[model samples]
Target chain A: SKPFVYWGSGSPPCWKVLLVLQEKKIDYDEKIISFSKKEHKSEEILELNPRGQVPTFTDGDVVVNESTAICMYLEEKYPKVPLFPSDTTIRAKVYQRMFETSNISTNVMEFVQYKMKNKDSIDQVLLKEKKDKAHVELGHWENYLKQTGGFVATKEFTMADVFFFPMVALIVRQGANLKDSYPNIFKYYNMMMDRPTIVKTMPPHWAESDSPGNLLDLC
Target chain B: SKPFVYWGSGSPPCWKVLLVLQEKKIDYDEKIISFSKKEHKSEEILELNPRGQVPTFTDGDVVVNESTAICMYLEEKYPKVPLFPSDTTIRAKVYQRMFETSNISTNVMEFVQYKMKNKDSIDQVLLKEKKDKAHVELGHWENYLKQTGGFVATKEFTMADVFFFPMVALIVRQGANLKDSYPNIFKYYNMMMDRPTIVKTMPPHWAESDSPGNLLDLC
Candidate 1:
């Protein structure tokens, strides 16, 4: 039996697993659960994933939730095209960048949630503060790109880039422009868009919509 | 050259690194930066770690900021006493449990932050919702214990336990009674405390203050 993954669209974490799967050429089956339909909360998904989050991946009897865990799982099970570098320091870089992407994700979530909380009755001052903090994190990522050249972690592309890219992609999808504020990240993001694995696994609905969402137009 | 760590009291994330270091018997230097004094934000820490979070771990050329990442760095570097099981499925469990601990930590952060956000005047209804959500996640851990026996992931102690134990310890120390609501965790928590590594690395001020913290008394 092939490995299976329960995935959802617009979930970067789900994209993390999909990207890894396609990168490694793992023969797997996937069920795309719709957020609109609340399919992720269906009985089937909850059985495998108590948290009811997507990218609940399985091989044989083992079930894994948490996108990074799922990413690490694929890397461990199918090491043919390894995502992590073997060099200890390089591997450290992978871990550092992956978790640092998490920090960036944290800031993005804070910014998005408050912006999301009250569409009309929102606090402009707080929203502006959130945006600045989120951009400041992106600033650090820009510095990382400048220091390391093109990639998020090591000289060559690694899992850190896989983990980090969807975050920037989402902000862009939401109408944020990276060209002016973060040239290196902007360049890197453009390059990542051309990767076959990334292209193959692009979120279904994202391409359906022509114009950006404009949620982050100010950004 | 010895590995070094910057740690803080009352910080589970900091405790995670210290626990891993002691478990591996790594001869490491440690600086317990005073959280009360705002030492974590000092220029000294900010240089090596931009985030200035606790568990700013370093060894020669490499530095790791996150606690789990630091634990993983130690495991990758020192395999003499392996914290991860060699069995693939077991290792999957380790990874699963580690990330699940992250989920639990998220709930705890949600719970605790609201409690901490405002002291004298507060939204009791929101605070109660937070605590309930936090405990619901704990209920899952209880089920995991019932299914997996004593440890967090495997039958034997693993890095998953290293990543998770501190979260529960904090709750218990915060005066939450686990015996009635989560008897298995209560038992597991007791067994963990007896381990030499856990005992040796117990947070400094945690022991200095004899009384249990009442912040989580309602729990």
Candidate 2:
């Protein structure tokens, strides 16, 4: 039996897992849950993932939910195409970058949530504060890519790229302009967009909608 | 030469790394950094970790900064101690729980920051909202512990336990009573506290201070 994935469209976490599965050429059945209809909280998804979060993966008897964990699971179960580098230092760097992406996601999510949920009562000062932090983190990523040349952690693409692509992509989708502010990120973003797997797995809704305004253009 | 660990006394991230080192029986040199004195921002630490965060680990030529990544690097470099279990399914559980713990830490840290920095201008509604989310996350962990008898994810203690101990301990330090609220977590907390490594690596200042009240006592 193929692995089963429960995911929602346009979810960054879901995208990370999908990107890895496509990259590894894993044959899996995808079950797209609707966030709008609260399908993610349906009995079926709740069984697969108690938290009802997307990117919930099940292979045989094993089930993993966390995006990075799902990526790690795919890497471990299907090691033919390694998402994590073998060298200790490079692997360590991949781990660092992946976690750093998680931190960035938290900041970005806070800013996104404030815009989406608190639009009426939005605190301009607080929004700018969160946006500024996210920008600083993005700047760090741009600098990191500058130092490393080809990818986030190493010359060859790894899970670090898989983990971060969705984040930067989501930020761009929200109308943040990486092209103007982060030239390296712009280059990296285009490189990721060109990848066959990334191209194949672009969020369906995202492909349909017009790009949003510059929440991240804090500068 | 012993691996050098630059860490702060009461930092949760730093504590997680230190607990892992002690648990793995890895011999290392410790550099106690004073956050108040700006020692962690010194040229030395900034060189080791450009972010200047605590729990900066250096083993020979390899340097790792992120807490979870440092634990992973140690697991990879020193396989004999086996902080990560060999069973793929069980190991996947460890990764899932570890990342979940990381998410929990972000929420807790935001709440902490509000209390420390924005205490005067703190929004009670926002504070309660963050606290409520944390409480729900903790409840999920409590259910997790109930399902797994000994540790966070597996039968035996692993890096999952190493990752969560400091988070729960920090919550307890902040005056939340797990015993009354989360019986399973209370049990797990005591079990972790009883471990020699946990006993040995207790944050120096946390040891000196009196435990603080029920911000998380939402009920």
Best of the candidates, lDDT: 1
Every candidate's DockQ is 0.70, 0.74
How far residue A156's Cα lies from its native spot in candidate 1, in Å, is: 1.0
Residue by residue across A1-219, what tens digits does model 2's lDDT show?
A: 588998888888889899889999999998888888999888888888888778788999999999878888888889998888778877999998877787776666677776777578858877778877777777788899998888988888998888888888887787777777888888998998898999998998877777766464543
Per residue, candidate 1 scores C-alpha lDDT tens digits across B1-219 of: 689999888788888888888888899998989988989999999999887778788898888887777888889998998998887777888888887787776786676666656766777777778778887898889988888887988789888898889988887877778888789898899999999999888888976686445435645
lDDT per residue as tens, model 1, A1-219: 588999988889999899988888998998999999999998999988887778788888887887888888788888999888898877987888887787766786676666556667868777788777887788788999999886898788788888899988887888777787778988988999999889998899977766445445645
Pairs that clash in candidate 1:
none
Native contact fraction, candidates in order: 0.56, 0.71
lDDT for each of the candidates?
Answer: 0.83, 0.82
DockQ score for model 2, please?
0.74
Q: Taking the tens digit of each residue's C-alpha lDDT, what string does model 2 give over B52-96?
A: 778788998888888878888888888878888788888899989
